[PDB]
């Protein structure tokens, strides 16, 4: 419980799928380019799911054209059309910052079977 | 628990942990102990949480106690005739009683004791 839960529950988004760090996802983020709303897919590994409630952020990492990229979205942001989980990851940590120094097969999360 | 805001009791976090362990050991061994007011104030949550572990009688709780106590006789006492004694009690296992100050340092003193009213 918190003291502002009654304020946050309004903006609290349903349809947020249950995911966790290590889980690979596709975030369909709304992108505006000069009076033109489209959707960009940030496909990447969740390294982090900080926070609670409306303030909850999740950080998704990918390697685009030979460069690491991380997007820290709010979980209940309405700029996110949806989040499509693809693979769940077997990780022994809650925050996969060690991927920031790993490029390639070293940065391949163990899929959950 | 709510950690020590200020400087720790024994000039070190280590010596604070050791103090609290030894003082809880003594408190469960003897029922009451006289020490300084701050040491008692800090011990009361420590000891009450160990007693909570003792009320929740199970091996996990016994080991979570033994990682602080290290006196097996006191651990047994906790899990045999303290925890059960306080099964009906929802907290409030200890009371602090302010007493006369020392002479050599005028240190405020307090007797921290276990309650025995039920």
């Amino acid at each position: 419980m918190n003291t502002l839960d009654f304020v946050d529950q309004a903006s609290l988004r349903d349809d947020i799928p249950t995911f966790s760090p290590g889980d690979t996802v596709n975030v369909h983020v709304k992108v505006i380019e000069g009076s033109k709303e489209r959707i960009q897919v940030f496909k990447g590994v969740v390294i982090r799911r900080q926070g609670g409630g409306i303030s909850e952020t999740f950080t998704v990492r990918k390697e685009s054209y030979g460069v690491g990229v991380e997007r820290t979205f709010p979980v209940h942001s309405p700029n996110i059309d949806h989040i499509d989980v693809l693979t769940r990851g077997d990780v022994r940590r809650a925050k996969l910052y060690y991927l920031r120094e790993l490029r390639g097969k070293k940065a391949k999360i163990k899929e959950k079977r | 628990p709510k950690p020590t805001k200020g400087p720790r009791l024994g000039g070190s976090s280590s010596h604070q942990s050791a103090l609290l362990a030894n003082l809880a050991t003594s408190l469960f061994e003897h029922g009451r102990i006289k020490t300084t007011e701050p040491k008692a104030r800090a011990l009361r949550p420590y000891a009450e949480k160990l007693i909570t572990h003792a009320k929740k009688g199970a091996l996990h709780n016994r080991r979570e106690v033994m990682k602080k106590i290290r006196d097996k006789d006191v651990v047994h006492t906790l899990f045999a005739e303290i925890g059960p004694f306080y099964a009906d009690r929802n907290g409030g296992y200890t009371r602090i009683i302010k007493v006369e100050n020392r002479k050599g340092d005028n240190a405020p003193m307090a007797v921290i004791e276990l309650v025995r009213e039920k």
Binding site: - | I97, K98, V99, E100, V111
Partner: protein, 54 residues
């Protein structure tokens, strides 16, 4: 640093008076029948018997 001059008696005493003691406020307690005076801080422990009343 050091004091430039001998402080006068007036000023010396003016602050030396501030080095005093606040006397403790006492209350009555009826342990062992007799009415003794203790601090309210120690009232409980005196009712119990943890207060050396000389």
């Amino acid at each position: 640093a050091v004091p430039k001059r001998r402080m006068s008696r007036a000023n010396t005493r003016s602050r030396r008076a501030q080095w005093k003691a606040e006397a403790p406020g006492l209350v009555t307690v009826s342990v062992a029948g007799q009415q003794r005076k203790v601090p309210r801080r120690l009232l409980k422990a005196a009712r119990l018997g943890l207060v050396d009343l000389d």
